[PDB]
Ligand binder design. Structure first.
Ligand code: MG
Length: 550
């Protein structure tokens, strides 16, 4: 039956798998012969031969064009290489938090996820291949380094050319490989079930069911933006929890699609009909939270509100709260909440690996970042739909509007006004000059102490550095992670680099009750001015304005 053939291949040189996997244009995975084949083989060749027959890999993607074709490739190469089994979501569909869930539930060696996050879908669009390891999280640098090494010097791979998988039908498919003994096994599983079952156990589905249907039900609008979370929204929020069907918009994943991307949802909330709104990104690991009339809960505040009401979530009632965490550029809203408890607050460089490590050491329960990310140690990826059900949980217990909840939070903890300026496609030379100069300035002896007037408001430098982080688990040192100007009132200016892109984060703390409900862009203006003056950004880049304000 099913023959195994060796295909001589010519290696590529730009297959570096990053933190979110390998992302290229789809016309590359199609014009470039054996481009995908090479990489899938490289990933699989990191699994020792002796461990393959007993191994299971989870496979799924975000619905984008070329996904199903890709999953077919993976099966043909997994089989010919001796991987014993694939678990694949029906139709190829699995959200990234669903994959993390399933890897951990069935103890797979890892998974291959076909997504490209927020990136455009279609023939003239992007496609990405991401590898996760046995703890359900993204492959660390050491693994992705080996895949890259293998890919650059690869000379052959193995495939089952004639092997096809019916992704439409539930159940176990088997394949008799020529000159093998044990069969290749594919399990097509319901896209939503294992994940929904996890959520069912985390949250009080009875309470949420009550909240979302009947007399004075909470009216909600959930925008999956034609991404992967769609089916998860329909099966859980509507079908199981009883939210009316029109609660769910764009919940059909399509093969071709910040604060301006959910412009649709914002307009809808702005009518004043709904009490709560939410949107998700491509693969389900990010979330935007909205209140009546379009009230914007910024991601930094959102993890803080969740932290402050965390015990209205059954999961945390039972497992307890092992720690809090945020990325360094996220606002210090969370810190104010952690400060009123006995629970540690870790501040990490941007990146998942840092959270995952603290989680794996039983030191982190809740984590968030300013880039629309919220998560917990229930899995090892960020979880957008989970964040929404945490909020609904909080709403059902608090019984107040979303805006009244933030107002109460700000009155208790003070407010951390936050914004992020993006400057996109700036000339690298100018930006790097800007960073190198600003750091040199900051590093001077008589810089700590230096004052800056708004005026009226006066800020004083408490600390200024290029953020470093020793990871308490892997021991790694992460250097040059962002310029931080830290002020004595608990306000911060942060610069990061990533043509090029500058990110300016501004975090202004206000405790005054007559100041906490003012317009953020007005309250932030003095620190923004200070930021631009000290960095000489307009002078170094030519930009009189950011590309995007969040
Ligand atoms: Mg994402």
């Amino acid at each position: 039956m099913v023959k195994i053939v060796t295909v001589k291949t010519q290696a590529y040189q730009d297959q570096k798998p990053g933190t979110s996997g390998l992302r290229k244009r789809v016309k590359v995975f199609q014009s470039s012969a054996n481009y995908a084949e090479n990489f899938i083989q490289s990933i699989i060749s990191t699994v020792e031969p002796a461990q393959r027959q007993e191994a299971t890999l989870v496979v799924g993607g975000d619905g984008r064009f070329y996904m199903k074709e890709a999953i077919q490739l993976i099966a043909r190469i997994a089989a010919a290489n001796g991987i014993g089994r694939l678990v694949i979501g029906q139709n190829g569909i699995l959200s990234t938090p669903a994959v993390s869930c399933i890897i951990r539930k069935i103890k797979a060696i890892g998974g291959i996820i076909l997504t490209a996050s927020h990136n455009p879908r279609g023939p003239n669009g992007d496609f990405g291949i991401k590898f996760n390891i046995s703890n359900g999280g993204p492959a660390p640098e050491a693994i992705t380094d080996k895949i890259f090494q293998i890919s650059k010097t690869i000379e052959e791979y193995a495939v089952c050319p004639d092997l096809k998988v019916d992704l439409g039908v539930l159940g176990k498919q088997q394949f008799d490989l020529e000159n093998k003994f044990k069969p290749f096994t594919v399990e097509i599983v319901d896209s939503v079930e294992a994940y929904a079952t996890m959520l069912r156990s985390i949250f009080d589905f009875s309470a949420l069911k009550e909240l979302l249907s009947g007399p004075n039900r909470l009216k909600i609008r959930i925008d999956a933006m034609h991404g992967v979370v769609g089916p998860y929204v329909k099966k859980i929020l509507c079908e199981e929890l009883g939210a009316p069907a029109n609660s769910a918009v764009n919940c059909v994943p399509l093969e071709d699609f910040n604060l301006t991307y959910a412009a649709d949802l914002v307009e809808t909330m702005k009518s004043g009909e709904h009490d709560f709104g939410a949107a998700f990104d491509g693969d389900g690991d990010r979330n935007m939270i909205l209140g009546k009339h379009g009230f914007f809960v910024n991601p930094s505040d959102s993890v803080a509100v969740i932290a402050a009401n965390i015990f209205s979530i059954p999961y945390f009632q039972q497992t307890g709260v092992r720690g809090f965490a945020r990325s360094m550029p996220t606002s210090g809203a969370l810190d104010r909440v952690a400060s009123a408890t006995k629970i540690a607050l870790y501040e990490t460089p941007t990146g998942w690996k840092f959270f995952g490590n603290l989680m794996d050491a039983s030191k982190l329960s809740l984590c968030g970042e300013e880039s629309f990310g919220t998560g917990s140690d229930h899995i090892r990826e960020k979880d957008g739909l989970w964040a929404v059900l945490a909020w609904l949980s909080i709403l059902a217990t608090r019984k107040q509007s979303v805006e009244d909840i933030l107002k109460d939070h700000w009155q208790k903890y003070g407010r951390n006004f936050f914004t992020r300026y993006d400057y996109e496609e700036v000339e690298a030379e100018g930006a790097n000059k800007m960073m190198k100069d600003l750091e040199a300035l900051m590093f001077d002896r008589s810089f700590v102490g230096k004052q800056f007037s708004a005026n009226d408001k006066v800020y004083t430098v408490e600390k200024a550095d290029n953020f470093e982080y020793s990871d308490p688990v892997d021991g790694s040192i992460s250097r040059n992670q962002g310029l931080r100007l830290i002020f004595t009132d608990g306000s911060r200016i942060v610069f990061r680099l990533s043509g090029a892109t500058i990110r300016l984060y501004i975090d202004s703390y206000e405790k005054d009750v007559a100041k906490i409900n003012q317009d953020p862009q007005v309250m932030l203006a003095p620190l923004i001015s200070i930021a631009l003056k000290v960095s000489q950004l307009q002078e170094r880049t030519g930009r009189t304005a950011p590309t995007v304000i969040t």
